[PDB]
């Protein structure tokens, strides 16, 4: 017996209550470590420096996730066929105290772990990854990391502060949460202060590849050089939904001109069929700032090709 | 132990799954034994004779309701203490053929009233309302109404067909589901085609109150005399939601200019209280005619309001 | 045998030709002289002093009208069982020189009424009352007026140029157009420079009536007072959308805060009937400023109230 | 004589009454005799799966159609010199009973061919195809086909029902209207079932090309490989909008990720050139869905080129 | 030598830099010195319960400020004739940190007010009046207050924190910055949890006026009973725009229904005539949630009507 | 010292008066004779033939600027180490007479080269390009031009006017302004009248390179050849925003299907280093037709890649 998404002969797609993909919700701890794999959401948003929003993310991407079938035909993929999921709900944050919403959600991320569950999270800003990768270490040790963003977020301090959503992967390095030559960076662009804005990176061990590396062509060759960097242990994936151009992904809080397709986008993810997966991530994504709902709806489809990919998926 | 809705201080109003006012979502034969009501949602638009899209109503009103409290600060009512009250889903019509979906309503509503409990609905196009009230006579016998529209909607046809959103109550006259002495219809305005098109009405023994009779004016003396005219038995209550003027509620399938303010509409519930309930309904809400979202807000608030004034609730 | 507006037995509202009402198109010389009145559009936007757009009026305003029925449920008036009524189309207007465009307006209109046509007219900004005016002192002499609008619209001057706007009454006085002892003023309100600003129309004989004095109160009792002044002779009616409250009107070029009604707009052109109409006008509707419809699908339903009240017009 | 769109010298283009290019409105025996080929509407979807809307297609294409002008700059074509070209309106179908408007849809095109006129038709959802292809074959026989779509069409029932807007391409087959071996599907992504939902056309006789093929590629050399297989008789073209991108082409009623671009769609119609053509046309055009206008000013600008690659027209 | 704001004679309206009423921005210490009274700006959202977005608040209030004039019909008040005014610019607060948010705040207006400056405050949420009247008594002593409101913002906690936007005024009541008998409260409605919720309130000394107390009537005899009441010494006035209808201010964090119109909110700023003003504000305006503008248009025309009624302006 | 933009450490970018970049306001005869180059806008609309609203253009395009930072880390360019920059207002135009503001154009860009300034304008429609031009012969003598546009623009006349925006350059080569060996235009496209409306050009010795040559290919061959042509001499750069493909630009006045990439658009201007530029202008943004704000943030975007291109600028 394993969990399946509601039909469209059962019930017509614009009704039913709104889950992830239609999906069961689960809360009790016997029932909790039955499962293999879980979508969980985190709405947090006052760590931003320009426009707020994001904290209506996870409510917005369930909604549009309806339209959704179980087989892939491009790559044979059947994911359940072989694993058991569902949906887990969202984690109580504080909004009033930033750095008291921080310890609550390590807190929660060490009680998911023990359970045995590999989780794929809805956000919410970039400040969340951090917490994050505090409890994954602690279970499997030093990691390697796949990362897609139009900004390095590297900062020492933003206003004085040590704690932000563009200081996260300088934090991380400090704490000793990575191994630092298994690292890739992919869509940097724009404007900055110095030269040593994108150097810091690659004096640390990093590679670095820069959205002029990528007009005009196929990302299929490139992802044979990712995964020869990264491999040989376990990987987390994190992505910013800025890295992709503003004529597909308008509803976020920092946009940026020139950049990745949705072509594009689908090559990198399709491309990490053979590694060690241990969690995702899909960011930043902000409902106020788009009206159609577009933004929301490719979101979804994104976090679709994410468990197409993780190991043990038969092919049929 | 009765059901209560989800606090601010457990989860920010912002997070959660989206049932009415956050309650649990029933499913099971014994728990349904145990309610007193429950709210309910029937998805369809293919009786309509202009604009389409309030197959998307009752997702709408969900998503807007988290923000209700439980206590009436102006009435002093407080239903949560007294009934015990949940979601239970929605109806799976059959959006290709009009006739079959008419039969599947009526079958739905002969159950639910078999488990003892008395609906609140959730449209819609005003087709509905028919199957529902074949159901109600089979169980109490014939009925009085409460009816709050901008038209008369009593058409002997529409394009040459029999069932229609426009013919909904010449059927229930000539079906015998009414009790003919005891109707009164409220907001009647703009244009038509002979003076027959509202005097047909009045020869049935109906009391029609127009538009211009309401201008400039407090409502609370009018529902006194509704009182005299519909009591001594069983009633049903309908209301449109294109009988509020267009300023309060843009987003309608068929809008008049120049009708109710929302102060009148909080007075006609209000004046409600001491008669013989057993069933209510809101309709026609089409959430892609307006984009704030405000249309479908106006209408959950609403619906709480009927809650208030159901038999059997305490006051403190 | 009359011309008729298409019904929704015949065809459904959503689909044909989208003229006025739906009515026929008519062009010939023979056609013309046959015709007791006629809907006509003047597209022009180059006289405008804050925001523009109003070039698009005439189309949006046709587009809304499919909705309107032929028969007055409250007053019992009949238009299209007496009269002989269509559409005429457009004027050719000079986009790029606004001198020449006055011009080509008078010339045409001399022309409309020379076929012994009375018209209805589409806006289009304040501008083109001037012209008009021009025309029909040449037909019937000397005439009265009634005038709805925010604004006094009485300059001397504008940039240093003397056509414009904001200019047209002014103008009309030193041209020896009207009677100055048949004319009021009914809507003004918000900022000045001196107490001139409206004390220059009292003291050339005009009634004035601020908005204040309109506040919380009925207009059935003022348009009684407003009959005895204007009467004994031939009349004209020209309406300024930024009258009504923003609420109800957001799509215009210069908006106000604390205006009419549109129940107290129903009360003045209801309160015309008996009086010796020549000619009718509503102006300064912008499209690109209102994204529901709502502005344009009241235009339409006011010039249909305008032909109810015309002289010639049968009760039943 | 020859029919000609209005000039901006005659008239503004934000002016006049709006048919499809400013053509003039053809309603009499004698004048439909006359005419070589023509543009008709049919405003239905009673048969969607997912979202409404498209009950408005027809009239926001004639009013976005004011930009075009008669010469093709690029190939040289000249349409309007060649043939006599004019704007019919509309066809009355039932919006309450499905299987009724079927009927009517088969015997007006029935008269339309009585007259030898070749029709280019507006729409609507794709239950039409059905019907329209019914009435063909009576007159030319058993054609050939080339469809451009993200899905592909060929379900057994939907809900239990034989008549849908994603079974018209199985009953097709089934009826004997298509030459099997003479057929083309062009985009089909996303996801499905079984590996059978693609491989059941293939069996049939089919040539598939899904979208994965296409990425990153002109398609001049694919049309030569297309002339080839579907020439040597008569033939038939239809176009799904929701084909293109999103990005591109956001109001329609089911959406799928990474697409066509407009450039590659432009390649296609303009390789059509050389084969025998007797009908065109372009469905699931959503107005509600879209806030510019974007789609529907893409779907005019579609259309003319399938006018230019009629039989009959010459280049200069 | 007095400061004026630019007219439509020397740079029309759409044009030039885009300051408050489009005055001189005031930057150095001397001339500072110099001023009576200036308009200044808070840009803080960080305290919210629900909705963000306020911080882009000042912005577009200052942006849609181009279209008033200097001199009051209805009042006869001439300010610019009078008293010295300009924009000074924006405070610098910490968006990554509340509690040093609240520190900056009272700083710099103790600088403000060592000028010898009255301020007139543009928001930003309602967490920023406790600071200021911090500031406010140590220059003049305890104060009374007229306060305008849908609620009434007396909680102990949010979330179990001391400091948000909901227990602003039980902080002041505790640290003795008010005179309890010289309060009055104006709007209250909605729901609750206990009848306490208004009842404490009334026990400290001040008078709560409901809606429904409102409901039908003009408030000029209720202003009277307020002067009488609230005299006698130095007072500070408080507007939060979620207390007028949802019809008028969509644009707003928490919306409640059935409220006061734009009619009555100018009866009462007007109704201020006579007292010891030292201080006012205006507050929760949310750009996001209002496409059309005319949230902040109305905004920016109540502040000029708090400009004109200060003790010191002179009648013509 | 030279002048810079204000940082995020200093105030948030949300907050502050909105100029260019956040730059300083000069306006003394002093302080203006010390700028090495400047930014100017001129809002005139009067002049356009389908859609109006670019009168707004000027301010929009600042309030998105607030982003920017000033290294850029593709090139190494740093403008503002090496020239003294600032923002100098508006040009004061007379929106009634559109021959009037053509001599108001030409007399106040007379006054700025007499100060030695380098002009980067924001437009404004198409007409304003002529009278600038007549300006910068007169300091200069006979330039050289690089134009980007969907369209020629060299029509005898419009509607029997011979000024308007379509017209522009047809009158340049009549008044002997330019050197006729050094012209190239790129990106015309769509319909016409004769095969002599791209021939015209071509017999007077420009360049023209049409759509289909750019389709599927990187454009940094192609400025090698461009550059030879045009150099030897001083240089005029006009960009048209309508050059560019509606998904990325959908607020402008005559958009057109099929065209140039935002990273082809960033090829051309990072690929005129090397040339001797004395003026630069971006035209034709309307934003009433785009909701979103996306056109003004890709106008302000690349007037920063125009300044960074400017003879005397260092890179490190
Ligand atoms: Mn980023
Ligand atoms: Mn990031
Ligand atoms: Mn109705
Ligand atoms: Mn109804
Ligand atoms: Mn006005
Ligand atoms: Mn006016
Ligand atoms: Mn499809
Ligand atoms: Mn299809
Ligand atoms: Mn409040
Ligand atoms: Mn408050
Ligand atoms: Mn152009
Ligand atoms: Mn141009």
Same mark, same amino acid.
């Given at each position: ?30 029932? $909790? ?88 999270? $809805? ?9 994050? $990768? ?10 390697? $990391? ?13 206003? !004085? ?10 934090? +991380? ?73 503003? +004529? ?22 399709? !491309? ?45």
């Amino acid at each position: 017996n394993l969990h399946q998404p509601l039909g469209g002969n059962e019930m017509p797609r614009f009704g039913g209550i709104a889950t992830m993909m239609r999906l069961p919700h689960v809360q009790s701890p016997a029932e $909790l470590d039955a499962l293999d794999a879980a979508f969980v959401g985190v709405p947090l948003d006052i760590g931003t420096s320009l426009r707020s929003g994001t904290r209506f993310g996870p409510r917005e991407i369930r909604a549009e996730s309806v339209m959704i079938r179980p087989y892939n035909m491009a790559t044979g993929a059947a994911p359940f066929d072989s694993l058991n999921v569902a949906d887990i709900g969202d984690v109580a944050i504080n909004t009033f105290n930033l750095l008291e919403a921080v310890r609550i959600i390590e807190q929660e991320y060490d009680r998911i772990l023990g359970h045995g569950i590999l989780p794929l999270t $809805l956000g919410g800003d970039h400040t969340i990854t951090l917490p994050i $990768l505090r409890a994954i270490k602690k279970k499997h040790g030093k990691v390697g $990391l796949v990362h897609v963003d139009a900004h390095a977020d590297v900062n020492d301090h933003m206003f !004085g502060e040590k704690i932000a959503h563009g200081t996260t992967f300088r934090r +991380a390095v400090e704490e000793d949460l990575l191994d630092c030559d298994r690292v890739v960076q992919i869509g940097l662009r724009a404007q900055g202060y110095t030269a040593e804005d994108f150097n810091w990176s690659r004096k640390q061990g990093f590679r670095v590849v820069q959205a002029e590396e990528c007009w005009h062509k196929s990302l299929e060759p490139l992802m044979a050089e990712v995964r020869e960097k990264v491999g040989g242990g376990p990987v987390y994936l994190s992505f910013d939904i800025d890295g992709i151009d503003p +004529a597909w992904a308008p509803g976020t809080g920092t946009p940026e001109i020139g950049g990745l397709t949705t072509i594009q986008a689908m090559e990198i993810i399709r !491309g990490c069929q053979g590694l060690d997966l241990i969690g995702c991530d899909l960011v930043e994504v902000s409902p106020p700032y788009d009206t159609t709902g577009n933004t929301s709806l490719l979101g979804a489809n994104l976090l679709y090709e994410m468990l197409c990919v993780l190991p043990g998926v038969v092919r049929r």
